[PDB]
Design a protein around this ligand. Structure first.
Ligand code: CL
Ligand code: CL
Length: 150
């Protein structure tokens, strides 16, 4: 539930790399580039890309403001569910720790921690930070995955 104090959304913008995740959903990889840009509604558009066969697919997630800076809500029509997404900790220039949790619909159970890094090569200290962060969130070692570059 913790949100990065004095959250500065403009400093959070730009290119990030999804470098790690932990989740309570078995079926939910490799590192993907994400681009964070402002949304019309004051929140964020999160645009991620991944390779399939010979092509680079693009997906956008609208993160709507949810009442406090660094807190968002995401609506997934295909899963009939809404999810809360919070930037728990970030220094803006190197890393971000995100936590997402279902709020409404059949995905209400869902929980996930995400590591964002400004570079494709996260330092050991950041991998230790993320492991410790997931552990704080009740994720066990088996559910923690570091995402390899390409
Ligand atoms: Cl503060
Ligand atoms: Cl760190």
């Amino acid at each position: 539930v913790s949100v990065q104090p004095n959250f500065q959304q403009d400093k959070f913008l730009g290119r990030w790399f999804s470098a790690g995740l932990a989740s309570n959903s078995s079926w939910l990889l490799s590192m993907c580039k994400s681009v964070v840009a402002p949304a019309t509604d004051g929140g964020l558009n999160l645009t991620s890309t991944f390779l399939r066969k010979n092509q680079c697919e693009t997906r956008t997630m609208l993160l709507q403001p949810a009442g406090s800076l660094g807190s968002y809500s995401y609506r997934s029509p295909h899963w009939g569910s809404t999810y809360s997404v919070s930037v728990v900790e970030t220094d803006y220039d190197q890393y971000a720790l995100l936590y997402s949790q279902g709020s409404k619909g059949p995905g209400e159970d869902f929980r996930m921690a995400t590591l964002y890094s400004r570079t494709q090569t996260p330092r050991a200290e950041l991998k230790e930070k993320f492991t410790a962060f997931c552990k704080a969130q009740g994720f066990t070692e088996d559910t923690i995955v570091f995402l390899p570059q390409t």
